[PDB]
């Protein structure tokens, strides 16, 4: 938007790394210094949420890009995620290969 | 934690939020330049004060590292460009009094007015009527009483300023670990922490000196072609062995020889290379120059400017509707944002201008994946210099005609050469010594080796010494010649313009040997060079994440300034002016003075 | 194979035999200490001999070795701890008589007794009688005439002995690449080889002063309302504005105020916090509470006690007829043998002490992994500060309700409060001052700053201007009030129990912080908090093989001594004493005297 785009957040501080597929949603204050802060935002201790602001005007390297990841593993309950098996036409009177 | 790991986390967010606000000033200034209206002017102005406070008061939580224990030199740099205290360090009396001596400076030389003795209603102000006359005026005696007149308003009521200016500067800097304001401007060429490319503040003036010990014989020659010339424009006025008067070299403070090559040109009959007609005649516009600034860049390697540049820039006056700055500027809004300003007309001068800002863009975007304390040039000197380089390579004669300006039935000689190099001179080491001698008098004012009662008598004399121009008349102590210029009484440092003006050649003759030239070094062109453009971008890269010495180093070899590219490029023209140098003695008597 | 290898291999022997030769000195000792009989002594005295000898021996050997090509700073401590000369350094005619000095100094304070007026046959020693009345004694004269005769006695006596003690010393120290004995005694606190976390001797007196300077504040209105207590109690003898006389103080010197609360209790209408007689009422006894300490200290996270400490650590008192030394004790006879030599009681006092014993037994077993060399504390005052934090935490009253020995109709209240803060005040804090000027009087006397002509003088001048003591009556320069101290005439340091008690509330602050507390600094529990537990852990396995400040900053994250924590404990003490201490002058005017 031509006044930024705030509603889209993203996690810049955590205390060690996310695992594959983790999700995460707390919001806690992340400890940077020594003492805890008592969860108050203040001197080393900042908010690990922060927003993005996209603009019309930004870069095409800060522009925004939905991204997605459709993503196929395996088990063993067969299933019904199978591709379309498309049709031709019904001839008579003729062998064919069906 | 120790604190190497809460200062990288300080870094980070600061630079996330900085980032976001600094955007958003820009933004605002932007549309403010492009449009003047009391909305944008409000805009602009909330978001200043804005960015500002946040500014500060990150600062202020930034001082709470002690500095001492980092070893990253890239942390090192950034909590050093951003734990300056700045002016804060003294007590808010006097960064009051500090602020109001600021502002009724800038506005008494902005809105100064002389009155004439002509006629009672007959006041003409600076930039416009008075330039006028002291750059266009043959009449001896009315660029001499404008000349005398400007100062005579202006510096007498500026030097009470100047008084408590100099002072309360000297006590804030001292009180920041310096020695003097001047040794805080000379802070920006300060490396240290690092072994065999450090800098000291104090070497600076030395290795300044030591250029301008070279510079000078060329200077000499050039001051003494001048006024043998000027002799035959205003006789009875110059001496054949003496200095030249300050109300003769074409400007009111004589910064620029430009003026004077109507009045100096070697060979007047043959005209200089303009390529005006020849561009109206193709029917070329803004657009159309543009492009060619960017096929030539892109020739050279770089990359293509942004897509937003051709959307968001406004390259063209919309007219007297939609009201702006018609100063050439290059606007960097950041994350990804760059615009140019300028009121592209149909003219050689606008070509030059064009292609100096895009060369200014280009440099923005080179170090664009630096942070934000860091996306800048390697010094106050270096983005100018690289601007600079690009207008010089297009001007050549033989880019003009590769791109189709100038026709092919055109083969450059001799005149021609000499007429653009003199012509050139005039303001590229015509001005060196104006400005080596106006920063060698602020640094010893700063310093306090020249006394209170001394200092129109030091400045003058030092005038004589090094640029040769005498006093038109007797000036008494209470007069401010200094501070009738810009850069003086508006708090700005005038040593870029000298060491960029050699870093300019130094990049030329450093680009040159990569082109594989084979003549002079005024006939150099970077166009199709890839070896040139991909050294010069492993430079324009680094931006101030590295010392600005190292820099240096990476295109043209030194650790250090070098001037003889300087005297290089001006080779051809200083042969020829000792050949005509021979006239009459080289040199200047400064005992001797028009009064 | 380089000097390492064979360090190497010298160190790893060296190790296996000094724990077998230690563990079998140490059973000696034990079996002599828990049975005092001549041949336990013969046994002690042999197994000790042996063991000296073979380290002397293997010191000698360990010289053979530079230690500056070696790199590994494991090696390089082992060996520094084990190539100190020592003593040996001096000639033998020098270390004979220093030793013999030695042995009369702590034989003529052992063997002191005083003669008295009253009656020629009413001699008493030092420790019983003459501690009974400067305790308990309400009366001036008396306890001023004991106070007076015993320094008199006993100063006047060693004063010969210690002036020939500090030039030996002095001479021995010198000879070890040191500056003097002080600076001997201060090299436990350096810290070399490791950037970042080296600390040289000279920075502990900058450090402990910058504490002092601090802890003044405090200290200034405990002994003024010390002060203002003590006039009902001592009329006619003490100033409204002057310093305390010497006498008064509790104590032969003064060190612990502890037998003041007698006469300086806030509020001596309630009784403090004593579960004496609630633990008869419930059947205790020395396994009851030893085993109430080991679930306290398993709760927080660390091992439980071996199998042979039940096994063979004597917890009560067999009676007189297997003769002990009652002396709270912890025995770390090596090879993971742990036992505890105390003549447990029914008594909160007892209670307090096992579980210091236990922390310190379980501060000996966390670093049981390293080598001999290396298996002790960081330095000299983080043991007894690991044994002391838990006393505090086990103090409290919540502690003392939740295992049931504090009934739970009964919720603390301000005045018990203010009660036990204040008493607490009169042992931990009143006695700081008193160990910060000690060891800066002999410091500066083994630095030579204080001439010989100047001892008495200048230690009485620092006790009226430091801990506010004056002195009863004019002391000639024969005195010598210092050597009537044991840990001054026995040849001990006394910066321990300052450094110490700082690193105890230190401590307390960074494992409070752990544990999620919500109140005062003084009603903290570190029990069923595993994290502090493990924090505390982590730096107790270090041991010595780090150095102290990386040992510190592992559990409250500084890297330097600081005393804020010590402030933060008395916060509400302190807060009160203001409140109160405003009835008179706050301080003391050194210039006044009682004579
Ligand atoms: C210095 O900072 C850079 C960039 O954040 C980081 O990649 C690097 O690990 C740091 N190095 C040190 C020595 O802290
Ligand atoms: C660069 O190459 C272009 C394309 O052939 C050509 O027109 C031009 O002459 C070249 N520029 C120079 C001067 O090298
Ligand atoms: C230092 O000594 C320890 C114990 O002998 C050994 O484990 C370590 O590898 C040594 N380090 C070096 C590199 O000498
Ligand atoms: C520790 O845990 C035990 C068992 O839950 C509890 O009885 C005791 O009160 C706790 N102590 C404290 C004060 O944390
Ligand atoms: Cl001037
Ligand atoms: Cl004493
Ligand atoms: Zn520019
Ligand atoms: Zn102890």
New interface residues.
């Given amino acids: 938007k031509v006044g930024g785009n705030y509603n889209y957040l993203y996690r810049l501080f955590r205390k060690s790394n996310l695992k594959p597929f983790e999700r995460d949603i707390s919001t806690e204050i992340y400890q940077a210094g020594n003492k805890p802060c008592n969860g108050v935002a203040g001197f080393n201790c900042y908010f690990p949420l922060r927003s993005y602001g996209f603009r019309p005007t930004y870069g095409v390297g800060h522009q925004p890009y939905r991204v997605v990841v459709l993503s196929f593993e395996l088990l063993h309950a067969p299933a019904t995620v199978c591709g379309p098996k498309k049709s031709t036409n019904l001839v008579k009177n003729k062998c064919v290969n069906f | ?1 120790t604190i190497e ?2 200062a990288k ?2 870094l ?2 600061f630079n ?1 939020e900085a980032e ?1 606000l600094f ?1 958003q000033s820009s ?1 605002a200034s932007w549309n403010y330049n492009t449009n003047i209206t009391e909305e944008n002017v409000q805009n602009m102005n909330n978001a200043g004060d804005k960015w500002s406070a946040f500014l500060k008061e990150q600062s202020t ?1 930034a001082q ?1 590292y002690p500095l001492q ?1 980092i070893q990253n030199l890239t942390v090192k740099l950034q909590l050093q460009a951003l734990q300056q205290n700045g002016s804060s360090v003294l007590s808010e009396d006097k960064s009051k009094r500090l602020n109001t001596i600021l502002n009724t400076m800038s506005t008494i030389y902005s809105t100064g007015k002389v009155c004439n003795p002509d006629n009672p209603q007959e006041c003409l102000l600076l930039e416009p009527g008075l330039n006028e006359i002291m750059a266009n005026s043959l009449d001896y005696n009315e660029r001499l009483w404008a000349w005398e007149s400007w100062r005579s308003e202006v510096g007498k009521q500026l030097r009470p300023l100047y008084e408590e200016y100099v002072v309360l500067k000297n006590e804030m800097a001292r009180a920041n670990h310096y020695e003097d304001y001047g040794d805080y401007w000379r802070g920006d060429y300060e490396v240290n922490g690092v072994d065999g490319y450090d800098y000291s503040r104090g070497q600076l003036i030395e290795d300044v000196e030591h250029t301008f010990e070279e510079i000078k014989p060329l200077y000499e020659h050039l001051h003494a072609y001048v006024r043998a010339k000027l002799m035959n424009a205003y006789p009875s006025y110059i001496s054949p062995i003496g200095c030249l008067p300050a109300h003769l070299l074409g400007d009111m403070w004589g910064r620029f020889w430009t003026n004077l090559y109507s009045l100096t040109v070697p060979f007047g009959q043959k005209p200089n290379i303009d390529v005006t007609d020849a561009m109206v005649d193709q029917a070329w516009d803004a657009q159309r120059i543009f492009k060619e600034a960017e096929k030539f860049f892109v020739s050279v390697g770089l990359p293509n400017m ?3 540049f051709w959307e ?1 820039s406004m390259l063209t006056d919309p007219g007297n509707v939609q009201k702006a700055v018609c100063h050439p500027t290059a606007w960097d ?1 950041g ?4 615009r140019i300003l300028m009121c592209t007309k149909v003219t050689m001068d606008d070509f030059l201008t064009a292609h100096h800002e895009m060369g200014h863009i280009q440099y923005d975007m080179a170090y ?1 994946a630096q942070p934000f304390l860091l996306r800048n040039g390697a010094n106050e000197g270096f983005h100018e210099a690289v601007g600079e380089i690009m207008s010089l390579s297009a001007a050549t004669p033989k880019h003009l005609k590769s791109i189709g300006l100038l026709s092919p039935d055109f083969q450059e000689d001799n005149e021609t050469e000499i007429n653009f190099l003199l012509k050139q001179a005039l303001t590229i080491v015509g001005t060196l010594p104006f400005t080596y001698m106006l920063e060698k008098w602020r640094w010893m004012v700063f310093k306090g080796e020249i006394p209170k009662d001394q200092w129109m008598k030091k400045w003058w004399e030092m005038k004589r010494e090094i640029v040769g121009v005498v006093e038109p008349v007797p000036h008494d102590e209470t007069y401010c010649d200094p501070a009738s210029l810009f850069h003086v009484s508006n708090d700005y440092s005038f040593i870029r313009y000298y060491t960029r003006t050699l870093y300019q050649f130094q990049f030329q003759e450093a680009l040159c040997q990569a082109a594989k030239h084979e003549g002079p070094l005024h006939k150099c062109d970077i166009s199709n060079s890839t070896e040139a453009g991909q050294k010069l971008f492993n430079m324009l890269r680094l931006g101030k994440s590295e010392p600005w010495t190292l820099a240096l180093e990476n295109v043209v070899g030194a650790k250090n300034m070098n001037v003889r590219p300087l005297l290089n490029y001006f080779e051809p023209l200083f042969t020829w002016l000792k050949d005509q140098n021979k006239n009459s003695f080289v040199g200047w008597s400064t005992d001797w003075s028009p009064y």
Avoid: R
Wanted: proline share 0%.
């Fill in positions: 934690s790991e809460q986390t300080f980070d967010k996330h976001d955007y933004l939580l709470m224990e942004t897509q937003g968001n809004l994350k990804g944002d760059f664009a």
